[PDB]
Design a protein around this ligand. Structure first.
Ligand SMILES: [Zn+2]
Ligand SMILES: [Zn+2]
Ligand SMILES: [Zn+2]
Ligand SMILES: [Zn+2]
Ligand SMILES: [Zn+2]
Ligand SMILES: [Zn+2]
Ligand SMILES: [Zn+2]
Ligand SMILES: [Zn+2]
Ligand SMILES: [Zn+2]
Ligand SMILES: [Zn+2]
Ligand SMILES: [Zn+2]
Ligand SMILES: [Zn+2]
Ligand SMILES: [Zn+2]
Lengths: 8, 147, 146, 8, 146, 8, 145, 8, 8, 148, 147, 8
């Protein structure tokens, strides 16, 4: 909900 | 062919990292321009006057409704981010205001490529080719028969 | 940068399979749409009211002036083709019943087998230019062609 | 001059 | 005096169509003629070989086909997985889940993007040979390879 | 050794 | 331990081990603490393919290979059935023109070819993890010993 | 060479 | 062996 | 601490997209510069006079010996690349990429290009062990008699 | 004729100041172009994909494998020199780098003439005449039969 | 080995 953890 | 359920309703591409679910229209669209000057998903959102989308589970970020961390707004035309490797989505206003370097998720009328990938030239030539006019009409018809 | 002489005067793309020589203005233009609704060369041809083009030798079709097989007309807005190999013919009269045809310009771009449509990707790297900026630049080109 | 042989 | 790369069965020498048998050291085409498999594959089954080389001037250049992962050259075990690039892999183990895949020999010929199918037009002009004559000839190639 | 770039 | 003991875990029942002809070491057909057999895991990791059974095994000393063409790739060999076995490549040698079952199923050799060590016999072994196998195979390139 | 005689 | 497929 | 087997022998960075295997000396090195003017891997290659490397399996490009497509040369100081959309072909500058047989070397500004081997961030190099130019030369000098 | 063992494997020229030994294929080649556009030795090196050479003992510089003073690299396509009436051979990179006026040993695809003498037209006119295709032809046959 | 004195 509002946060995106992108990989490398 | 019986193409997968998450294939672009305009042209059929179905790579899960490339499609976006329209939560209002309940159909999928890709982030390539094809023969238009903008991406299919954005054009649909403008044309059908929709605003809330969902990414696909097998995309880089899994299934995720885009919304503001702060207020829960789901209007992608207002959402953006400010920068190592965590990302927080924020409305430009007020939630990203000075009182509360920002950049929208939609630039050049497509979603950022790290959010939803642009399909390759090879991949768009092989898809069903459709014109800007054809989209405009087809969107006009979808009010009468969504099927 | 020192870009080649065959680069799109609007955006700089210089892939020889993608640029077209306008015989009248004496400037090259590519067949990508960019941020407008038509390709750069077509928009130029429409705006400057020109009609005769030449392809680059290093394109799939070599250096080639497009013209009707029958009469030699060079008006790209009148030319078309019929399969068989492709034979180019004016829509009228040369392709008439008495003398399956499709125009060379569809959706205000050249068919891609004639002139390659630049990929979305390669147009992103090219100089970004808006429809306002083309009219911007074409208006000036009569007083200063350079 | 009016006839075209297309790529492969 | 046919070029060095002509099909030892029927003579086709279009370089996009012939394949070198690395063991028997002769060339064969990927057309079927009147048989149920292509000349190269039919040869491979009869003479019991497995490793080949493509022609220098073919679309893929001079190339010994082999697995990306382990270097196996057994064309009957190899396949591929897909922007415009393909990776060759053994069916087992190198293409296994733990280590969309499709074999390189389908309907007993090489896929045409690997080795071009000669056209029916081009095979009628080649020396026509029946199934018996080939087995006949493979039998003879053991005593006199020439 | 194992990667193939196909024609256009 | 005997010279034919599994280089991973030490099992040395001759009906249970397999010789890797390339790396020149022996491995068992038990899974231990991993998801596949030691020998198969070894073959995949070191990228090998040719094996030899042990002489005091039920079939004696035998390099596995195709009856028809002589291929020695265990990932391509198989069989079709009273009491004789003919090994055949899947393609071309087992084709329609030339019910087939691979010798390697569920990442181990069939038990009638090379027996699966018992839970009893795998517990009395040197316990080793999948990480550790991966680790150890990596070192074996410079110092195989 | 390709032949296995089953034990019993 | 000489060909590299780059990230997204 | 017990660092993984693929950690930079100079400074400890072990992000697999950041380290490079020196095939000759059989040790790992990262592509960050620290307080030198070049990356640890490059500096090592010049001083120890090595040339052939291998990337780490868990990097974006997997376990991969860099070598010329045409001749198989493995000298990183001679290899470069040419684009093909997101495919790249490596070639010796001469002869294999010559006019008769737009090219760019893999090592620019004494490091590997970042799309081949990631340059660690200034932040991530600060967390790693700090090493000066003096200490490295010493250590390279030391590695000849006792590689350990 | 019974030509010496060090005769150009293509055309027969055998002046020791003009030929170069290929260390991999173990044959000799001259530094003249003959009827081709490059010298025989280079053409072979490009064709057979070799890189390490040796000069003949009776040449001006004696029997010598060309290599970098610094690292021992023997790849002639990377080597060059910098003047001392003495010359030092160095890799292009790193050994001749700024941190470590350089000119390659191969320019216009032949060895520099002070390294390997170019035979005179008189000597090349008398040699066995061979075309570029015949050389291509002949290199292809040489893996099957090097003889 | 890497140094050459050109002929007199
Ligand atoms: Zn679409
Ligand atoms: Zn908000
Ligand atoms: Zn343009
Ligand atoms: Zn006409
Ligand atoms: Zn044939
Ligand atoms: Zn394999
Ligand atoms: Zn074991
Ligand atoms: Zn077989
Ligand atoms: Zn480091
Ligand atoms: Zn080298
Ligand atoms: Zn090379
Ligand atoms: Zn010569
Ligand atoms: Zn050097």
């Amino acid at each position: 909900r509002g946060i995106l953890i992108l990989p490398a | 062919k019986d193409l997968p359920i998450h294939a672009c309703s305009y042209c059929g591409i179905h790579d899960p990292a490339c499609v976006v679910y329209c939560n209002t229209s309940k159909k999928w669209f890709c982030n390539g321009r094809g023969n238009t000057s903008g991406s299919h998903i954005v054009n649909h959102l403008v044309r059908a006057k929709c605003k809330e989308v969902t990414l696909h589970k097998d995309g880089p970020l899994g299934e995720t409704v885009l919304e503001c961390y702060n207020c829960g707004c789901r209007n992608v035309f207002l959402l953006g981010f400010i920068p190592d490797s965590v990302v927080v989505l924020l409305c430009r206003q007020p939630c990203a205001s000075q009182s509360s370097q920002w950049q929208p998720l939609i630039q050049d009328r497509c979603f950022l490529s790290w959010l939803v990938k642009i399909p390759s030239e090879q991949e768009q030539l092989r898809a069903r080719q459709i014109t800007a006019q054809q989209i405009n009409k087809l969107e006009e018809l979808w009010k009468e028969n969504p099927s």
